[PDB]
Structures are given as C-alpha cells and as structure tokens.
C-alpha cells in the first residue's frame, strides 16, 4: 500500500564449528532502521536509521531480548526440522521467517503477512485473512496443527492488525524527513556504438526513492519489448536506488526511440531521448 | 518494534 513495515530473520546452521548464526533486520518502506547479527561484536539490536536512534534504552533492551530468544527458538527449530525429513546432522540448513503489515493512505491497517521458509522454499504462511494457515508439505501440517491448537494466528493477527500499524505510524512521524520523502529520478541517456549499423541506447534513472520504478521503451508511440535489456533495481548505498534499461537500435533512427520513466515523484512520466 | 517471541515449530 502507501507504507509498510517489515522484518526479516535468517538462521543458518554451521554443523561442527559453532551454533547457528542468527541475523535480523527491520525495514520501513525501503529504509532499513534496525539490525542484529550473532557474529557481530555489539550483541545488541543496533540502529541503522537516524530517527530510530532517539528511542529510549527500554526499547533497545527489549529488542535485544527478543533476538536473543528468537535465535534460541530457531536453534530448536533447526534440530526439530532435521527430524521432520530425517536429515543428517552434517547437512547445513537455514531458516527464514518474515512478517509485517501494509497501511493505506490513511495510515490504517490494509494488509498483513507472516511467512516461514526452510531451506529456501515455502514452509507455512498466514493467509490474508490472518486466521488460517497454508502448509506446504506433509511435515508442514505437523506444525500447523500444533499452531492451530495453540491459537497462534490469534496472537499473530494482533501484531499485524495492531501494534505494527501503531508503531509504523510512530516511525513515519518521527522520521518524517526520511521516510515520507520522495526523490524523483535523475534521468539521462547514453549512446554506445556497437556496430556500423547498430547502436545501443541506454536510459538511466538515478537517485530515486522509493525503489518502485518502471522503465518503458516506445517507438513512434508504441511499446517495444523486443531488443530491450532491463536490469533490476540496485541500491546506491546513498539511501537511494539505481536502475537503467537499454535497447539496441539501427544507426541513424534513434530519434524515434523514446524512453519512459514512471515513479512516485513524477505525476506525469518522464520522456527521455538522445537528441 | 518487533513481534512477540515466536513459537517453535
């Protein structure tokens, strides 16, 4: 929707040379603001955005207590899961959990999700009604019935319908100059001679936030999907993102090929040409 | 803020 808060947790096992490594990150929109790493030296929930740093020590002491227990929960999850499929103790596995809520323009609850993955594929997820479950395999329904008898979906719905949006609004207002901003793309176009008859036109879009963007190629006002190379959005590290789309063009008729950049900070889409 | 401590599978 308009805004969203998300968390990501990963626990990779290291059989024979240590306990499973736990990494937790938190994002609002496309901005990371918290992180944790069992291999890091701080051993605490660290800030990654300027606005989150103003929180009190009870906030950081609490978030540190959660990841220290969440890591322990994933440890018994890895040991239990290797028995669900009867896997050896030498194979290295990983666990991924994520959840979050999406809000609308009124900053009220619009959508919630909570998903769990084992070894890179889906395990079990909360449906869009936040009341049912979607188990992947036979062993996935073993934990579903274990979580249905414990009324897990009831207390998970509360995070997504309740404190997620109430603490997402708290983050949207405190960090207003960071999260509620919108940076229009800085666009330009390069020209590269491939052969005597063909040349590639590359349409650049830099320094834009959020990451959602659409790059379309048109010829005489008609979309052209053939002979087009589009690359996925790249994080610049400046807190902004980068993306470009190219097209190979017969030499001499680049006047007809038009690039089109659609973004949140652009009411009407931009149109890029070579000359 | 993060969620409650999760349930073990």
């Amino acid at each position: 929707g308009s805004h969203s808060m998300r968390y990501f947790f990963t626990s990779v096992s290291r059989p024979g040379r240590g306990e499973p490594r736990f990494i937790a990150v938190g994002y609002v929109d496309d901005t990371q603001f918290v992180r944790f790493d069992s291999d890091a030296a701080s051993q605490r929930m660290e800030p990654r955005a300027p606005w989150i740093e103003q929180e009190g020590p009870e906030y950081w002491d609490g978030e540190t207590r959660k990841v220290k227990a969440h890591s322990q929960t994933h440890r018994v999850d890895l040991g239990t899961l290797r028995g669900y499929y009867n896997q050896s103790e030498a194979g290295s596995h990983t666990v991924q959990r994520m959840y979050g809520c999406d809000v609308g323009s009124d900053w009220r609850f619009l959508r919630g999700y909570h998903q769990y993955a084992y070894d890179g594929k889906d395990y079990i997820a909360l449906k869009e009604d936040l009341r049912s479950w979607t188990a992947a395999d036979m062993a996935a329904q073993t934990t579903k019935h274990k979580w249905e008898a414990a009324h897990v979906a009831e207390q998970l719905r509360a995070y997504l319908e309740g404190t997620c949006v109430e603490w997402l609004r708290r983050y949207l207002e405190n960090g207003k100059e960071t999260l509620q901003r919108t940076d229009a793309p800085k666009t330009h176009m390069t020209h590269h001679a491939v052969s005597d008859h063909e040349a590639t036109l590359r349409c650049w879009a830099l320094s834009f936030y959020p990451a959602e963007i659409t790059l379309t190629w048109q010829r005489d006002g008609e979309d052209q999907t053939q002979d087009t190379e589009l690359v996925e959005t790249r994080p610049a590290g400046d807190g902004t993102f980068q993306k470009w789309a190219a097209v190979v063009v017969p030499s001499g008729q680049e006047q007809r090929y038009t690039c089109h950049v659609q973004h949140e900070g652009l009411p009407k889409p931009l149109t890029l040409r070579w000359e | 803020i993060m969620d409650q401590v999760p349930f073990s599978v």
Partner: T-cell receptor, first 111, second 111 residues
Framework: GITQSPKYLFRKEGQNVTLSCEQN?????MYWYRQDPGQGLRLIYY???????QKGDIAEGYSVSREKKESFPLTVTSAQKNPTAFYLC???????????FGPGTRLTVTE | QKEVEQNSGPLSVPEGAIASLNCTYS??????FFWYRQYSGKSPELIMS????GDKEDGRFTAQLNKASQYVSLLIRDSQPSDSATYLC???????????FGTGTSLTVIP
C-alpha cells in the same frame, strides 16, 4: 507443572535461604516475585534464556542462578532488609506471554 | 505511576448482581491483556485472556477490551461467594519484552 518447596518456610535472621522452583512446562522464561500483605506483586528476578537472568525492580539482598532450563533457584541473603513475604515463582513461554504461578512459599524471618 | 493501574480499594457487589472490575494501563506496545484471580493465601489463577477490541465471554465473566482508550474490564455475572477474591490485571509490554501486573482489586460479594 510448576512446583515450589516448601509451602511454609521459617528461618533466623542472619542466614541464607534457598527457595526452589521447578518447571515442567518447558517454558523458556521464569519469574520470581514477592507479595507483601495488601501491596501486590513486585518482581525480584527473571530469566528468558537458559543462562540469561536479569535483575528485577527489587534485587537488593537477592541472588539467583539459572544453570539449566528446568529450575530457577532463588536464594535470599541477609542483605535483604525485610525478607518476610509471600514469594511467588512463575514461568511462561515468552517475556510478553501470560505467566503461570506455583503454589508459593511463605518465608518468615524473625530476630 | 505504574505501567498498569487499578483501583485497589475494596469493591462490594450484592450477590446475584454484576461486578465491574476496571483496569487501566500505560501503552508499552501493549498487545495482550489478562485477568488473574487470587484467593487469600493462595496463588493467582489465570481466568481470562483477551487480545482484540470487543467482548470475550467465557463462563460467568466476560473480558472487555478497548485499546483506543487504555483500559480493560472484567464483568462478572451472578456474583457467588466463591467470587470473593482480589483480581489482578495483567498487561504485556512489547516495549522491553516485559510483563506487568497490577496491584489487584479486592472483590467481596455481600449476601
């Protein structure tokens, strides 16, 4: 499945006591409270992991050690100015989840 | 003040009438709300638990929760002599990963 021992305990002022608390629910967290007559509950010590215990509101004169997940032995010392109270041990799955109490131990220390 | 407040003063309700025990709290990312019953000399017994706004009925008592205004209540129907006890209010706290108890409200049904 939470048990405490004994139900009634009485000691002399100046020596140490060891109030035991066993947990059968396989809960990760355990809690220790004291209840004075007509003044509610007050947290003494609490733990959330096997070897991670943290001080409560009134930890003066109290010591605790969670060496394993099953037990939460709280030992009171002579440094406690008013040891006489109703000590309640609780345990729960998570720090933010509902707790369940044992039968409780009434300790009375006299001059 | 405390994270969870409730009128500790002894409230009286006639037998067969409806008892209304109120409880307010300070929002600490509070998400789960519970009611404990504790008879004189024994341990608090978990009797009620609500997680969303509205009413939740179970037995002769209902749990009413409002999160816009920080307060949770417990209505008891057909007040019996076995209902005379102090009822403790419990509110979790995601800010700090904590669990907080109120001082308790002593209920005495009068015949």
């Amino acid at each position: 499945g939470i048990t405490q021992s004994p139900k009634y305990l009485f000691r002399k002022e100046g020596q140490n006591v060891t109030l035991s608390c066993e947990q059968n629910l396989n809960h990760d967290a355990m809690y220790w409270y004291r209840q004075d007559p007509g003044q509610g509950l007050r947290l003494i010590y609490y733990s959330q992991i096997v070897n991670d215990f943290q001080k409560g509101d009134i930890a003066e004169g109290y010591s605790v050690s969670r060496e394993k997940k099953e037990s939460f032995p709280l030992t009171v010392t002579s440094a406690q100015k008013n040891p006489t109270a109703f000590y309640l041990c609780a345990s729960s799955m998570g720090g933010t989840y509902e707790q369940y109490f044992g039968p409780g131990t009434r300790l009375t220390v006299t001059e | 003040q405390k994270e969870v407040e409730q009128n500790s003063g002894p409230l009286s309700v006639p037998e067969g009438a409806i008892a209304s025990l109120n409880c307010t709290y300070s929002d600490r990312g509070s998400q789960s709300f519970f009611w404990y019953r504790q008879y004189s000399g024994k341990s608090p017994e978990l009797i009620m638990s609500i997680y969303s706004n509205g009413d939740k009925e179970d037995g002769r008592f209902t749990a009413q929760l409002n999160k816009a205004s920080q307060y949770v209540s417990l209505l008891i129907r057909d007040s019996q002599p076995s209902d005379s006890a102090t009822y403790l209010c419990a509110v979790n706290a995601l800010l700090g990963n904590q669990f907080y108890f109120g001082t308790g409200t002593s209920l005495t049904v009068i015949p």
